Design a protein around this ligand. Structure first.
Ligand SMILES: [Mg+2]
Lengths: 122, 130
C-alpha cells in the first residue's frame, strides 16, 4: 500500500524532486535515522528515511535508505530513477558547449502519460 | 508479481526503449487495446496496454496506458520518464554538436540507492561462546 518516506537531504538540492503520489508520501525528516529507528514505525509513522549527505555527482555513495523492514524494490527503484534523471540532466548541463543550457531547455520534454482503468465489460 | 504490459506503438519507434526494463514485463501487442479489454485478464495474460498512436514529438498527448485494474502511479511514472528521456535526447542530438550521441550516453547517471533494513529471539539459541 502507500509508503511514507522521510527525506533528510543535507544539500537542499534533491528534496524538491519528490512529489506526493498514491503509492508514496514524502515528508521532511525531523529526526535522525537513529532517532527514527529507536522510535519504531508505530510511533514515527514512516516506513523508511532517505538520507543524502552531499552532491551525488561528487560522491554517489552519499545517499542511502534505511527502513524498519526490508522494503519492496519499487521504493528504491522509484527514488533511484528520480535522482538518476536529475543527475543525468545536471551532468549534461555541465558540458562545455556555449549554448548547452538553451539546447537542453528547448529540447526538454516531460510527459505525464495518463493511466486509465478500462470500462468494465463483465 | 511483475505486471505484464503489452506495447501497441503505431509508430514502431518506442518499443526498443523497453526491452531492458527491470520493473515491468513488456511485450509486443498482438491485439488492440479494445480487444484485450473485451477478452479480459484471464484470457489475455497481460495487466495493461501502453498505447502510442503518433510520434510523441508531433503530438505528445497521443499516448495512454490502460489497465484491467487500477495501476500504481509508478507504471505511468516509469514509462513517462523512459519516453521523455528518449525524446529529449533525440531533440538534443539534432543540434550541431560533434559526437553528441556519445556525449549523451556518457552523461547518463544510473544511481541505484542502497537500501538497508535497520538491525534489531525465542526459538533461536544464543551463541555458546556468550
Ligand atoms: Mg516520427
Amino acid at each position: 500500500d502507500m509508503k511514507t518516506i522521510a527525506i533528510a537531504d543535507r544539500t537542499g538540492e534533491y528534496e524538491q524532486l519528490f512529489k506526493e503520489n498514491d503509492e508514496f508520501r514524502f515528508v521532511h525528516a525531523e529526526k535522525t535515522a537513529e532517532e527514527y529507528r529507536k522510535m519504531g514505525a508505530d510511533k514515527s509513522g514512516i516506513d523508511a528515511v532517505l538520507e543524502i549527505r552531499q552532491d551525488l555527482l561528487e560522491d554517489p555513495n552519499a545517499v542511502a535508505i534505511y527502513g524498519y523492514k526490508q522494503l519492496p524494490a519499487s521504493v528504491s527503484n522509484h527514488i533511484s530513477r528520480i535522482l538518476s534523471d536529475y543527475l543525468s540532466d545536471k551532468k549534461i548541463a555541465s558540458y562545455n558547449i556555449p549554448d548547452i543550457k538553451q539546447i537542453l531547455a528547448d529540447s526538454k520534454i516531460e510527459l505525464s502519460v495518463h493511466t486509465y482503468k478500462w470500462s468494465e465489460d463483465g
